Amino acid sequence: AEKCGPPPPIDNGDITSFLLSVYAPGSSVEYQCQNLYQLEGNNQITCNGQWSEPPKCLDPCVISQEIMEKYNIKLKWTQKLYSRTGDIVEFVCKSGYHPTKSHSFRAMCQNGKLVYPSCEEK
């Protein structure tokens, strides 16, 4: 009723306290995302019976060696592998393979996507 129910469960994250069975009116709850996950919204959503809009964990990017070796590319600073939402990743070609100009070798990480440039041999 005038109090509150359970806090809304977000993806790739959770609240920062012990989950109460019944929540008081007007109480706000802090949210936290997993590692490298970028939060987008108010971490403290307040409590009528309907909760405030919970924040969203923006996904990060995983640059695995498999995708790079299939594209014949390396990193400029070869190896963090993990990148946050917005971190620019600078790729380079491998020995013998030259750039194909398919994409600029400076790739941004938006949510989950990240476009990989390619390199080809003579």
Binding site: D14, L19, Q34, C61, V62
Partner: protein, 294 residues
Amino acid sequence: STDAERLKHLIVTPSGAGEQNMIGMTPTVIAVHYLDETEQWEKFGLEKRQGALELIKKGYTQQLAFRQPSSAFAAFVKRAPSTWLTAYVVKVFSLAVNLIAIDSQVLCGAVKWLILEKQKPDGVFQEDAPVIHQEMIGGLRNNNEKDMALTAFVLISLQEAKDICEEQVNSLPGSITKAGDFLEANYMNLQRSYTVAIAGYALAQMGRLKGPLLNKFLTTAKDKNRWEDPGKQLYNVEATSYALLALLQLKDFDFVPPVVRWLNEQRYYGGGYGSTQATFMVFQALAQYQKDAP
């Protein structure tokens, strides 16, 4: 069932820092666990059970002195928190909830820490502060396939504390799923029988050790009774115990008798330098065999 006359030495007094104390709890906790689930207390001496329970109490409250405010655990309070030590403490305490009283918030705070802080985007769990005693971590000391084996270890500890931390941690199912996704993705590329066994147990708990992945697990066994790699035999005993627990989850009881026969024929009764993971897993697997015996 292994005669309890040999296991008298596993009753010890937990004494040490954030790591030695768990090396002290491990034999006492797993011995009481074994004798309870095998129903050998009457012949071994039931009067000793209460005293052994008091020893487990000591280790529990002593370990609480090393619980960092981040709900994590390390050898000292001002030291960096270890992912493996937190997962192991969760595992030992999750078995100990059947023996002594345990605060649920301690285990669940440690689980929330492992999920939010020490799980990478692809579901891998990362050890950012390795323990001082690399002999208490068993076959996981080997560097090859450290990602797969550590993720499986933390995943097994999370699924053990599932009963206690389901209500308070909503990120637990998603974290378990992400870890199993990583294991399933890189399972067929494994070459180390220890990793095949521990990841097989983790996936079998999730009901994912099926199809070709399942085939790899069963075909890794030499002579269809043991999971071994070139190295110390304590690692091979730990791996075969993980494999026995995976088999017991898979209900493949036509494969179990040779494995239990090999485990009994090793005559391993616990103890030895860095015998923590070996003693814990061998007696966990044997106890779960006697409980799930066909």
